[PDB]
Design a protein. Structure first.
Ligand SMILES: CCCCCCCC/C=C/CCCCCCCC(=O)OC[C@H](COP(=O)(O)OCC[N+](C)(C)C)OC(=O)CCCCCCC/C=C/CCCCCCCC
Lengths: 151, 48, 52
């Protein structure tokens, strides 16, 4: 934990950029400059398909990036605003747990490794379906439940 | 003159084959680029 | 007039049979929760998933 950085704006934080493996994850819909000076200077390749902005970590100096994994067994995970529960192909939370302005928050498994980065959520009544950027064995994927709004 | 003069398309030499060769080569490279782009769109349309 | 009328009616019957085939080959996938329709069958029968 504590490896993430808030992407700062003029007067408030609009999202969170996470360090995973050797890439500086950052959602693309959120805009800002990133707090840390060096990270702001990297070339961020974008993709509207996956709503992501990533760049090679200066791994010569950043040797603290979070571990990652590709398997997502159904169970319970945590995202620093509570505990996210897995079911089928959705992530659900208590309705008030999620809030705008905290998009890009990494979510971990029980062993302290990230599995997905939240982009937004759809309030389903009691639960909130999370739109996340995860990855399978090979390549990233964007699970977007119906009616999910950006954060 | 004891003949007539009309538009270009029917007056070009039989050695207009240069035009056909250049146009066909450009059309081939354009078609290959379009096919590659179509294939890339197809997998990108199935990976999401 | 007769030839034109029947031929357009023939193509109408053909398109109706195509629509009926699409309905009867797609409803099993519609009823089943999970929505695992393959990409190939979605393209052939001209349907889209709920995550695209
Ligand atoms: C390695 C490769 C080697 C191969 C090379 C092949 C060579 C290429 C050759 C072409 C040969 C052309 C021979 C045919 C010519 C005979 C046509 C004709 O018999 O005509 C001749 C007339 C006679 O002259 P005159 O004095 O009686 O007329 C003017 C009257 N005065 C003077 C009072 C103004 O001349 C006229 O009238 C013409 C007037 C109109 C001409 C202008 C044409 C306008 C075209 C515009 C195209 C627009 C671009 C389209 C882009 C759209 C985006 C997709």
């Amino acid at each position: 934990n504590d490896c993430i950085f808030e992407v700062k704006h003029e007067g408030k934080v609009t999202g969170y950029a996470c360090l995973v493996g050797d890439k500086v994850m950052k959602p693309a819909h959120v805009k800002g400059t990133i707090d840390n000076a060096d990270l702001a200077k990297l070339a961020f390749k974008r993709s509207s398909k996956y709503d992501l902005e990533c760049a090679q970590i200066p791994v010569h100096m950043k040797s603290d990036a979070s571990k990652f994994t590709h398997e997502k067994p159904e169970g319970y995970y945590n995202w620093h605003h509570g505990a996210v529960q897995y079911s089928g192909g959705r992530f659900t939370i208590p309705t008030g747990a999620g809030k705008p302005g905290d998009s890009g928050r990494p979510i971990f498994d029980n062993k302290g490794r990230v599995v997905a980065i939240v982009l937004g959520g759809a309030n389903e009544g009691a639960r909130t379906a999370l739109s996340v950027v995860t990855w399978n064995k090979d390549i990233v994927t964007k699970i977007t439940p119906e009616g999910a709004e950006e954060w | 003159a004891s003949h007539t003069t009309l538009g270009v398309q029917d007056i070009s030499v039989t050695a207009m084959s240069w035009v056909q060769k250049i146009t066909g080569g450009v059309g081939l490279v354009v078609a290959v680029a379009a096919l590659i782009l179509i294939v890339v769109l197809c997998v990108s349309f199935s990976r999401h | 007039s007769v030839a034109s009328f029947v031929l357009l009616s023939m193509v109408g019957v053909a398109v109706g049979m195509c629509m009926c085939a699409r309905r009867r080959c797609i409803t099993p996938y519609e009823l089943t929760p999970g929505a695992t329709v393959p990409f190939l069958l979605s393209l052939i029968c001209c349907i889209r998933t709920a995550k695209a």
